[PDB]
């Protein structure tokens, strides 16, 4: 049951959530990339905040 509480978070392969430019030079990307990204910012910010000694709040 404890597996339902996730420690390591699986990350989908790049070609499944691709980022590629098109005609006109402009780029294109999946929303999953941005989601994963924000998850990463929050996780790393918390990561350094825990080692920081920041207050419980």
């Amino acid at each position: 049951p404890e597996w339902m509480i996730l420690e390591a978070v699986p990350v989908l392969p790049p070609d499944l959530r691709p980022m590629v430019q098109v005609d006109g030079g402009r780029f294109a990307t999946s929303d999953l990339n941005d989601l994963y990204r924000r998850l990463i910012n929050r996780n790393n910010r918390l990561k350094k905040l825990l080692a920081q000694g920041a207050p419980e709040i």
């Binding site: 699986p10 990350v11 989908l12 070609d15 499944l16 691709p18 005609d23 006109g24 030079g25």
Partner: protein, 1112 residues
């Protein structure tokens, strides 16, 4: 010669048909109106409601607003692919309250798109139109509870974005509850600060008895305004702590705020004349002397509780009634979004004040363009009410402009539309067309405005009615709204008149959409014309009385899909509205004043006017439309004849001598032919292709963009590395196709070279490179080549290069090159044809002139339609059109038969008799009697009793002729057809759908990156989607390998399709595939959800579908 029918003479002409968009957008602009004398409505309403703003101690204010002149004209904006717009400069004075500092200073705002004369805008070089929206009128209303059968729930409501919906509902405790923004609370608790207590709520309030005690709560009535203000602020907004000043400000912004809450002027008026009270402003309550004072709630609770008592005079409102429904026109919408953007700008201003230097700041630094710019940009580009203009023909854009949609933001959607808003209410009569509407999931949602229907200032659609006093009709025409119509009793347009007064004792009338037979003494009104009960396209259907509603709908909708033809002709039998259609469409050139034509040619028609000025009219020749249909103007005037004012000069694509020409007039025979006309299929005589009938011109335009990639700059040039001589022919100098060059699919319109991503040639590849010794060179060929199925001649040439005047190109891109390509399309097998009566059809095989069912004079028929389509669809109008078309073909005159005031059977029969006298008379004048085969057909027609026995063959052929049926000889045999067959002139239409565009097949093309599925649509060179239902079909058949190929090899399976193509190329049988490869994506996606997906084997063991790939 042109003959008119009917006794109903419209006293009033059809009002300007493009007027809704043009006038509404006129009232929301006030360009010519001085900044002093302006109306304070529309854009200036936005200004005055967003200003002044005060929040140190800055005080802003507005002064004026200025319309700029367009930086580029229509055509320029269209071919630059730029929105047609002009700079709007607000002149706004900034002041300081405490300092007394006055720095006035003008400012900018943004770019505002201008509506053209036809009534459409241009966004990003594309002509677009904003459709009118239909919702319910502002005000308050009362309807029985969905939950409770015994009572009536109350509703209060303003304009959208002008503040929230309000619902007064008695819960069943006996207690009352109010609902705004999804929540519950008693009314008294709201009565609160409005200056009411126990006594003031029990005083008058009871004529009731039982209804007074459910209102009262002594716990709330004990506390007084600011305390219960804190209470309601605690309930309705739990987020922030229950402060008193927060409650004050918030609940002031919710109700008493004239800016934040604007109840419609029409809603103001209507609510004022319903509740039996009056209202100062547009606000629900008033903030006065620091305390709130009641406006709305008191009389609406009065009317609520009164109606629920059962006292006379109070009644439930009709929801779908058009008196309770109003139209959002283009100006009101534009102004709405304008004021939204203006609000965002207000917030920007407010943010910019509290920093920097509060002492000296010009309004120039305080104000930004982007909020309003992006607001308007978003509304024009994105919003559902803004859609691509219909350029297929003039009537297309006309009707598209007269279209009324219930969809879009702020309106309703496909899902929440039941039989409520889809149906036809009593009041749709002279306002909304009961027939015209798409035959799709959108039925009843998107409808059209009636011919004589008009929209007033309040957004209420009104319709003309002639007032009649004591049987005597008055020339005074009154435009009345739905309620105003509901009050009076209205007669019919076809009611018999004896020189301006009523004849019959029984007059057809109505009281609120209810047919009643009644005397001339009590009739106060009459219809102007039956035409006002239908839209424009519906009004173009002759003998509409004889056609079923469904096929009439289809008729109009198909008239919208009309493609212009080169030889295109106006119908033989018309309703008479075609003229005004071509006039108000502005697709034709007329004479602005009296004058004389001093020249013609196909470019400039110059006229020397009586006023002395010499004015030339430039003619648009072969201009590409949205759908591709050519827009062309052919002058009909001789050089040197004096024109009147308003007189025609040049026709439109869809015009003939000032008449609407949609399809052409052809000779139809109604009869089965060799099963070729089976299921409404259309056989056609090849003769049409000889006369260039139904030949349409379609210009399709392709563009290309030279950019600078990080690898290197793209360039437009004639030089291409591997290109042979013969393929470079028409490319003359800069690598662009010349004018007038035929381009085959695969041929290069313009050349382009882009440096390839630098990579090695493969060992075999470089072996080849060495063998031929041809230098592997730098750049690779990116050139634009015309897509398959498409091709034609090159007319237009456009090159926009950067570093050159008049053009600003987006970053990174050097130059854009665009080519117009026009195609000549004759009617082909598979093309679509249809009539005004809603008879669809495809061209099924064309027939040579040799074998045709023809007349005794050798005249062949042009179509042969199938009669079996007639009785099911129940459109008899086409039959009459065919009869009158026969008579018209023979006596050489056209006809005008208005809707519901028509030609009749005896009239048509008489015309047939006359035409027969001429025809047979000419037969015997040339020294010919009656043919033997005709005697045969007449004999067998006599036995079945189509003709009176004992009468000579002349009189029997006569009796048969007025029936519309004549003797027909089979061109294949020469033997006559057993029975007589109706023939005549029908007006038939080539429509948008063609085989040329719609035929596509594919073997192996591009595939999507995410999943390996082929792309969709023809434009992408796509494969056909095999749906789930089709899977069910294959499964039902029990074809396992067919379904397998469908699911694996032939669709997305990489190794499968590769090895298969390999096998067929080498002449094998295709192998068995393995992994669909979308399924692997499914597996890894499932693993991304942290779900372990194990593909097992016969014995519960892991089988890895990723081969040495993700194994690790």
């Amino acid at each position: 010669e042109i003959k008119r029918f009917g006794r109903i003479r419209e006293v009033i002409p059809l009002p300007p048909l493009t007027e809704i968009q043009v006038e509404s957008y006129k009232k929301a602009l006030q360009a010519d109106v001085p900044p002093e004398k302006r109306e304070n409505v529309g854009i200036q309403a936005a200004f005055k409601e967003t200003f002044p703003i005060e929040e140190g101690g800055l005080v802003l204010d507005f002064l004026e607003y200025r319309i700029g002149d367009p930086p580029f004209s229509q055509d320029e904006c269209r071919e630059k692919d730029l929105t047609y717009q002009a700079p709007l400069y607000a002149r706004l004075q900034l002041i300081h309250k405490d300092t007394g500092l006055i720095k006035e200073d003008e400012v900018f705002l943004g770019h505002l798109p201008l509506m053209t004369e036809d009534g459409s805008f241009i966004i990003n070089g594309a002509d677009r139109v904003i459709v009118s929206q239909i919702h319910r009128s502002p005000g308050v209303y009362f309807t029985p509870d969905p939950a409770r059968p015994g009572r009536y729930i109350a509703s209060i409501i303003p304009l959208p974005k002008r503040g929230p919906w309000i619902d007064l509902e008695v819960e069943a405790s006996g207690v009352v509850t109010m609902k705004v923004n999804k929540r519950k609370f008693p009314l008294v608790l709201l009565l609160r600060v409005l200056g009411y207590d126990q006594e003031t709520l029990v005083r008058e309030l009871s004529a009731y008895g039982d209804l007074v005690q459910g209102l009262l709560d002594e716990a709330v009535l004990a506390m007084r305004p600011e305390e219960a203000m804190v209470r309601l602020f605690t309930l309705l907004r739990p987020g922030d702590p229950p402060k008193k000043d927060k409650a004050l400000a918030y609940l002031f912004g919710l109700l008493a705020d004239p800016k934040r809450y604007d109840l419609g002027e029409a809603g103001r008026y209507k609510a004022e004349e319903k509740l039996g009270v009056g209202l100062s402003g547009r606000t629900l309550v008033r903030f006065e002397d620091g305390e709130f004072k009641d406006e709305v709630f008191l009389p609406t609770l009065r009317y609520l509780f009164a109606l629920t008592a059962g006292v006379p005079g109070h009644e439930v409102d009709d929801i779908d009634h058009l008196g309770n429904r109003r139209i959002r026109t283009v100006g009101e919408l534009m102004a709405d979004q304008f004021r939204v953007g203006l609000a965002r700008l207000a917030r920007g201003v407010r943010e910019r004040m509290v920093m920097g230097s509060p002492d000296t700041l010009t309004p120039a630094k305080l104000v930004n363009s982007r909020p309003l710019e992006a607001a308007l940009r978003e509304f024009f580009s994105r919003s559902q009410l803004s859609q691509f203009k219909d350029e297929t023909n003039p009537l297309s854009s006309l009707r598209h402009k007269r279209r009324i949609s219930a969809l879009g933001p702020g309106g309703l959607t496909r899902e929440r539309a039941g039989f409520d808003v889809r149906d036809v209410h009593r009041t749709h009569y002279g306002r909304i067309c009961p027939v015209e509407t798409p035959e799709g999931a959108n039925i009843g949602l998107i409808t059209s405005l009636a011919a004589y229907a008009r929209v007033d200032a309040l957004g209420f659609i009104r319709t003309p009615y002639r007032r009649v006093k004591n049987g005597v009709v008055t020339e005074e025409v009154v435009y009345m709204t739905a309620s105003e119509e509901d009050r009076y009793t209205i007669a019919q347009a076809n009611t018999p008149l004896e020189g301006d007064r009523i004849a019959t004792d029984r007059v057809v009338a109505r009281r609120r959409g209810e047919p009643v037979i009644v005397a001339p003494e009590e009739v106060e009104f009459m219809d102007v014309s039956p035409k006002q009960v239908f839209s424009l396209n519906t009004n173009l259907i002759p003998f509409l009385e004889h056609d079923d509603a469904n096929r009439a709908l289809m008729g109009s909708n198909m008239q919208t899909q009309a493609v212009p033809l080169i030889r295109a002709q106006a119908p033989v039998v018309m309703t008479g509205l075609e003229e005004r259609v071509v006039r108000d469409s502005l697709a034709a050139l007329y004479a602005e004043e009296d004058g004389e034509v001093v020249k013609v040619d196909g470019t400039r028609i110059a006229v020397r006017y009586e006023d002395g000025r010499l004015v030339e009219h430039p003619l648009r020749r072969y201009a590409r439309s949205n759908q591709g249909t050519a827009f062309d103007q052919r002058p009909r005037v001789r050089v040197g004849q004096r024109v009147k004012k308003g007189d025609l000069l040049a026709d439109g694509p869809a015009s003939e001598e000032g008449f609407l020409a949609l399809g052409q007039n052809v000779l139809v025979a109604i009869m089965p032919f060799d099963g070729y006309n089976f299921e409404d299929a259309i056989v056609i005589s090849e003769e049409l292709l000889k006369r260039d009938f139904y030949t349409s011109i379609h210009i399709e335009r392709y563009e290309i963009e030279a950019r600078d990639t990080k690898l290197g700059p793209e360039r437009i040039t004639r030089d291409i590395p591997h290109l042979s001589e013969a393929a470079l022919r028409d490319l003359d100098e800069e690598g662009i196709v010349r004018i007038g060059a035929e381009v085959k699919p695969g041929d290069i319109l313009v050349g382009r070279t882009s440096f390839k991503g630098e990579q090695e040639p493969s060992p075999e590849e470089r072996l080849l490179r060495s063998i031929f010794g041809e230098k592997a060179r730098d750049v690779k060929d990116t050139s634009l080549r015309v897509p398959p199925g498409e091709g034609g001649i090159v007319v237009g040439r456009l090159r926009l290069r950067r570093g050159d005047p008049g053009v600003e190109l987006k970053p990174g891109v050097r130059e854009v090159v665009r080519v117009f390509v026009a195609q000549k399309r004759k009617l082909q097998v598979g093309d679509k044809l249809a009539n005004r009566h809603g008879n669809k059809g495809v061209v099924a095989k064309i027939l040579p002139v040799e074998d045709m069912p023809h007349l005794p004079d050798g005249t062949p028929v042009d179509v042969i339609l199938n009669p079996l389509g007639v009785p099911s669809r129940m459109n008899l109008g086409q039959i009459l059109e065919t009869h009158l078309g026969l008579a018209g073909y023979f006596l050489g005159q056209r006809y005008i038969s208005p809707v519901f005031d028509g030609a009749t059977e005896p009239e048509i029969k008489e015309l047939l008799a006359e035409a027969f006298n001429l025809y047979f008379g000419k037969r015997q004048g040339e020294g010919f009697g009656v043919d033997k085969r005709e005697k045969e057909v007449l004999a067998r027609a006599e036995k079945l009793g189509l003709v009176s026995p004992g009468k000579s063959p002349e009189e029997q052929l006569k009796e048969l002729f007025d029936l519309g049926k004549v003797v027909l000889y089979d061109g294949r045999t020469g033997e006559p057809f057993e029975g007589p067959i109706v023939v005549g002139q029908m007006f038939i239409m080539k429509l948008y759908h063609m085989v040329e565009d719609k035929m596509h097949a594919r073997s192996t093309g591009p595939y999507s990156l995410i999943t390996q599925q082929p792309l969709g649509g023809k434009a992408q060179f796509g494969g056909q989607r095999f749906g789930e239902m089709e899977v069910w079909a294959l499964e039902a058949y029990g074809a396992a390998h067919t379904l397998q190929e469908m699911l694996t090899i032939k669709s997305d399976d990489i190794e499968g399709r590769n090895a298969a193509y390999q096998a067929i190329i080498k002449g094998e049988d295709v192998p068995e595939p393995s992994v669909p490869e979308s399924f692997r994506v499914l597996v890894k996606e499932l693993q991304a959800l942290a779900l372990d997906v194990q593909t097992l084997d016969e014995k519960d063991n892991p089988v890895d579908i990723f081969e040495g790939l993700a194994s690790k």
